[PDB]
Amino acid sequence: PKSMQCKVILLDGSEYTCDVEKRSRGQVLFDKVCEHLNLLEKDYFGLTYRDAENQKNWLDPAKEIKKQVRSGAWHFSFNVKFYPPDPAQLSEDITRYYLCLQLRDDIVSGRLPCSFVTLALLGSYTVQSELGDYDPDECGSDYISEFRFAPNHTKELEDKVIELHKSHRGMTPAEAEMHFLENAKKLSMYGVDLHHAKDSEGVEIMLGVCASGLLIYRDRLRINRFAWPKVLKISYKRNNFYIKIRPGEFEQFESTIGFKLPNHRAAKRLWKVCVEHHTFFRLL
Ligand SMILES: C[C@@H](Cc1ccc(Br)cc1)C(N)=O
Known part of the structure; x- marks a missing residue:
């Protein structure tokens, strides 16, 4: 059984090193880190890695580590998710x-x-x-x-x-x-994950993902907030990210808000963090 060395930056800035079988899922490494940390309330936390662009990605616990880090080093950080x-x-x-x-x-x-x-x-x-x-x-x-x-x-x-x-x-x-x-x-x-985007007019905005919903930071005077209850569907296609905003009482049709992300991977990343926040904070 061939094992790969993993290096994890802990929140105190120290480095934990362990080995996992090379076909291991992310959960295997995460379980080892959490045991090292004596952490039982594990659901709030996760591991990140940086890609060739030094962008942060959540390590999916359900997927093979190697199919996520791909060409990159098996170097991670332990973080609040x-x-x-x-x-x-x-x-x-x-x-x-x-x-x-x-x-x-x-x-x-x-x-x-x-x-x-x-x-x-x-x-x-x-x-x-x-x-x-x-x-x-x-x-x-x-x-x-x-x-x-x-x-x-x-x-x-x-x-x-x-x-x-x-x-x-x-x-x-x-x-x-x-x-x-x-x-x-x-x-x-607090707890807001910020993603650079353009609105449908090409105006540069930030989208924030947090427990309470999705935030659109247009300017200092214009901050739109969509509580998770008000969000029926989250989708990405090519460089585009779409949210379906529920019909307000007595309205016939949902509205659609579209955003342009820097690239396809950035749209996918935003989609997955939104789905995960929607699921987690729906269990509240
Ligand atoms: C209405 C209240 C709670 C809220 C609602 C939706 C989001 Br997304 C974030 C916060 C607020 N303005 O802070």
Whole structure:
């Protein structure tokens, strides 16, 4: 039995290495990673890989790994796939912990925009979780944390993290992580997967996929939202992505909204993430 070496970037930035039989399905590798992580609430998570274009793809657990990575290295990342709308309802602290690590990367990367005060508050809960109670001995008037809190760090942000950290004395790691999530979950881009597209007039938009539905970001004044209930059918053909928007009461016919994606693979990817979100958040 011939086995292939897999390398997985974990959410703390460390590398897990294992071997799977070369015809293994994605679920086999995912089960090994989740066992390594002591993670039971596995349904929220998945593995990604980067293609020759360094674009992110979800590894389909039901399909052979080799038929997805194809020509590429067996190199993956462990990521949150379905962001829980209410992390307080997860059954395990360790689930909330991995969700926090993913969100920290969402923030530092700039995928999850955040006000100054929310960056500082989130940063303060991470410090409380990671180091425990504020200690003046490690922090002078010139302190800069090892923790990455933001896409662009300022001394002002470092000071505000410390000021809020002082207020959390006695807070346990699970408590600070729950506070982190209660704040992060409210952010307008929480759990939103963004895809570049053109509308039917060739005007550049973003499509966001999240628990509550599909978001069309036209301009700052024009943001259309289609709750999953309002979406009857999702389709792709060539470079095009289509959604069927339900008849509103007393209307005879569904409406169709068409989008142009960069290429066929980008249309397919968007279609599959929409179907998966529609299924997952229908089970809520
Ligand atoms: C109406 C409310 C909830 C909602 C509904 C549909 C989507 Br897609 C996203 C959010 C909102 N404007 O945030």
